[PDB]
From Swiss-Prot:
Cross-referenced InterPro entries: BcII-like_MBL-B1 (IPR047917), Beta-lactamase_class-B_CS (IPR001018), Metallo-B-lactamas (IPR001279), NDM-1-like (IPR050855), RibonucZ/Hydroxyglut_hydro (IPR036866)
Binding site for substrate: K157, N166
Residues the entry annotates as binding Zn(2+) 1: H72, H74, H135
Subunit structure: Monomer.
Annotated control of activity: Inhibited by captopril stereoisomers and iodoacetate. Also inhibited by chelating agents such as EDTA.
Domain of life of the native organism: Bacteria
Reported function: Confers resistance to the different beta-lactams antibiotics (penicillin, cephalosporin and carbapenem) via the hydrolysis of the beta-lactam ring. Active on cephalosporin and penicillin.
Source species: Bacillus cereus
Keyword line: Antibiotic resistance, Hydrolase, Metal-binding, Periplasm, Signal, Zinc
Family: Belongs to the metallo-beta-lactamase superfamily. Class-B beta-lactamase family.
One example of a Gene Ontology biological process annotation: antibiotic catabolic process
Protein name: Metallo-beta-lactamase type 2
EC number: 3.5.2.6
């Protein structure tokens, strides 16, 4: 299914039940329909878009957003940390992400995740994994054990991606090893959600490795 706000669209497309995708204007993220509330992988550009998304989601799902997992300290992922914060929503991040958000003048996320972290939200089991530097020093990936769904963030580029994008903060040299790391840990990947663009499969990890050489 596909549901949208109105202009400066926010849209929720659906993967399996319980797993939807949130994208705002494009930047992607996840909405996990869990027994213990709604869990979000990444907020959005800013407070407005994150405030609107939270509101559209609690409405449809008749449930409160309780947790959010930030994949890296750049605006598109950490823009609404003030909203999450004031609202009592748990913003998870690795320690680096948090100190980087701090360094850039943002509310500090939890800095609670370690290299590999296994979270559990009711039925939902979520695995966070720091594969290494790539698009950004702190970028982590999210893996849903029960669906073989990988949220690759900006470490992974969509089919339509013909360049790496903003490489200002990137580690182009480590980047390929990092993606190799994901591929070694995650054999049999059903769907891969990029930080921007269309959702695809393992092929997306290979496309990016191609944009690296
Ligand atoms: Zn970024």
């Amino acid at each position: 299914t596909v549901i949208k706000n109105e202009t400066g669209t926010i849209s929720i497309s659906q993967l399996n039940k319980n797993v939807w995708v949130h994208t705002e204007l494009p930047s992607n993220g996840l909405v996990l329909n869990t027994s213990k509330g709604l869990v979000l992988v990444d907020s959005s550009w800013d407070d407005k878009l994150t405030k609107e998304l939270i509101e559209m989601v609690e409405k449809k799902f008749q449930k409160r957003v309780t947790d959010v997992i930030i994949t890296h300290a750049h605006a598109d992922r950490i823009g609404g940390i003030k909203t999450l914060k004031e609202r009592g929503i748990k913003a998870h991040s690795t320690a680096l992400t948090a100190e980087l958000a701090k360094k850039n003048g943002y509310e500090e996320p939890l800095g609670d995740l370690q290299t590999v972290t296994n979270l559990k939200f009711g039925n939902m089991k979520v695995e966070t994994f720091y594969p290494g530097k790539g698009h950004t020093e702190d970028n982590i990936v999210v893996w849903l054990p029960q669906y073989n769904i990988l949220v690759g963030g900006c470490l992974v580029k969509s089919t339509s991606a013909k360049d790496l994008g903003n490489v200002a903060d990137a580690y182009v040299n480590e980047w390929s090893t990092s993606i190799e790391n994901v591929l070694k840990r995650y054999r049999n990947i059903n769907a891969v959600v990029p930080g921007h663009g269309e959702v695809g499969d393992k092929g997306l990890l290979l496309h990016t490795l191609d944009l690296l050489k």
